Structure 1
């Protein structure tokens, strides 16, 4: 709870001012555990207080989390997902195909986000990924 989260907050505070930049709201939520979309963050970064604010304190954030808790919790449910590239039902997809789905489809990720992700994803010597194991690792928490 709040002790691990305070240590996460104290790592996001870099200046040591007690307050983190409002831009780093969606990384702090995600660091604690949650997954939120960057739309959901925009719909709860707005306020009359935090919309006007340049930085946010740990009491403010704890207040935001309490207000939006249900929606915020709803982001942690997803453990199962389905994806094609595999049509033949091998259970495997290439790293090229994974990069194409992540960077070319949906909200779109960057290549740097995908390159970051493939530092904590098993990839065999063929260059393929078991996508059932990959979904389990990403949801793992």
Structure 2
């Protein structure tokens, strides 16, 4: 799956909502303005962290080329597939490749940026599609890798 000319025009559109001063760069101040305009309340350490991990050139800001590679890659690259897969094995203590839906719903509503009951309900419905209480995280990763 590759990128069409239309979605590039939509990617520039969204890029220009971050780059509100129109100089072709996104700073932590521009990004923080968009996020807090969407109800978020991030700290600059988080704002600086969000810019750094997508700052390919390392110049401190996000230009449209970096923004374009970020939106087209999604979580489909090899580094992301291996890392997302390794993140699921941390809870696959049986070593078989399966994680109980009750356990996964429990950890996702108690650790990290915990999902709420509405969010986790939609996730378990797609993690345990057949409804047997078990999650094939290898098939679940490739589902969201696409």
* TM class, shorter-length: 0.3 to 0.5
Calculate the TM-score normalised by the size of structure 1. Answer: 0.45
User: Is residue 26–residue 36 contact of structure 1 (8 Å, CA) maintained in 2?
Assistant: yes
Q: List alignment gaps of at least 5 residues for structure 1.
A: none
Higher normalized strand content (fraction of residues) = 1
User: Is residue 99–residue 114 contact of structure 1 (8 Å, CA) maintained in 2?
Assistant: yes
1:94 corresponds to: 100
- SS of residue in 2 equivalent to 1:104: coil
Q: List alignment gaps of at least 5 residues for structure 2.
A: 1-6
Give the distance between the partners of 1:132 and 1:82, measured in 2 at CA: 9
1:34 corresponds to: 40
2:62 corresponds to: 56
Judging changes above 3 Å, is the alpha-carbon distance between structure 1 residues 82 and 42 closer, same or farther for their aligned structure 2 residues? same
Judging changes above 3 Å, is the alpha-carbon distance between structure 1 residues 96 and 28 closer, same or farther for their aligned structure 2 residues? farther
Calculate the TM-score normalised by the size of structure 2. Answer: 0.44
User: Is residue 34–residue 76 contact of structure 1 (8 Å, CA) maintained in 2?
Assistant: no
CA deviation string 1:27-69 (max 9, x = no partner) = 9999999999997358779999999999999999999999999
How far 1:101 sits from its partner (Å)? 1.5
Judging changes above 3 Å, is the alpha-carbon distance between structure 1 residues 81 and 130 closer, same or farther for their aligned structure 2 residues? same
Work out the number of aligned pairs and report it.
Answer: 140
Judging changes above 3 Å, is the alpha-carbon distance between structure 1 residues 75 and 94 closer, same or farther for their aligned structure 2 residues? closer
